[PDB]
Structure 1
Amino acid sequence: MLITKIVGHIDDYESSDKKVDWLEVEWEDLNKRILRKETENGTDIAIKLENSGTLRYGDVLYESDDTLIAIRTKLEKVYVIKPQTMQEMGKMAFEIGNRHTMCIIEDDEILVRYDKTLEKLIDEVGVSYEQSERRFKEPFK
């Protein structure tokens, strides 16, 4: 199926009886215009967005009488880094920046992909972190 435009937002279908076939994408895929990937049900999707438009989490790509195809990012292992002080947030984020590692910084936390080599740097900086799962919902960037 070639997809040239986004046709809705998956939250708007909360009471719909239509079944969702999820197209699961990488964090990198957020805000792309061109993407080729297969859905959880095996439907081949070629996204070639005709607007200067770009993909977001929870966009609906296709609506039939009974089915919705909608985007979400994959559920993946993360570290939630929890600096306690401003100096801590600064040194940690600097070292992440310097490494060119993708992250999301919201309030007093830094979210990064699980990675054992980075875990060793988190320890040099000396910040507490917790390991968890998330679907990345915002583009980087």
Structure 2
Amino acid sequence: MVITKIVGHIDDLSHQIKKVDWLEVEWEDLNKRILRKETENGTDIAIKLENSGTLRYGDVLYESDDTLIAIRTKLEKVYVIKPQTMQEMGKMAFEIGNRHTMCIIEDDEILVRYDKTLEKLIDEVGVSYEQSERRFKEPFKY
């Protein structure tokens, strides 16, 4: 099916009553309005948004009586940088921006894709980080 407009948004997944058939895309796909991929349950989806609205993690593409076809990003290896102070956050964020590395700044953490050549930078700045598996939940601005 061809999707030209979003028809809803999942507020709180745990509270959703309908079955959710997810369309899992790449982080970069959230900044696109054109893409084609199959949902986890096998439905062919071609997103061709007829507007400039940016896709949001959790957006509903199609809704039937008992199912929601929604979009989210894939689970992937990431570095969860945890600055302990306003200064640590600023300095760490600055260095990341300076090397043009994609990231998400949520609350007091900096999410960046796993990148070996990046650890030497975090240590250099002296910020504590942890490796993990997460889904980027916001399209990268830029």
Q: TM-score, normalised by structure 1?
A: 0.85
- Select between 67-76 and 10-19 the one with higher mean Cα deviation: 10-19
Shift of 1:10: 2.7
Alpha carbons of 1:8 and 1:96: their partners in 2 closer, same or farther (altered >3 Å)? same
Shift of 1:112: 1.0
Instruction: Give SS of 1:117's match.
Output: helix
CA–CA separation in structure 1 for the residues paired with 2:14 and 2:108: 32
Shift of 1:61: 0.7
Deviations 1:50-86 (A, max 9, x none): 1222311111111223332111111222211122344
Unaligned runs of 5+ in 2: none
Unaligned runs of 5+ in 1: none
Shift of 1:130: 1.4
Q: Is the Cα contact below 8 Å between 2:10 and 2:16 reproduced in 1? A: no
Match for residue 19 of structure 1?
19
Match for residue 104 of structure 2?
104
Shift of 1:41: 1.6
CA–CA separation in structure 2 for the residues paired with 1:127 and 1:120: 11
Shift of 1:16: 6.5
- Select between 4-13 and 18-27 the one with higher mean Cα deviation: 4-13
Shift of 1:17: 5.5
Aligned residues with identical type, % of pairs: 96
Alpha carbons of 1:97 and 1:8: their partners in 2 closer, same or farther (altered >3 Å)? same
Q: TM-score, normalised by structure 2?
A: 0.84
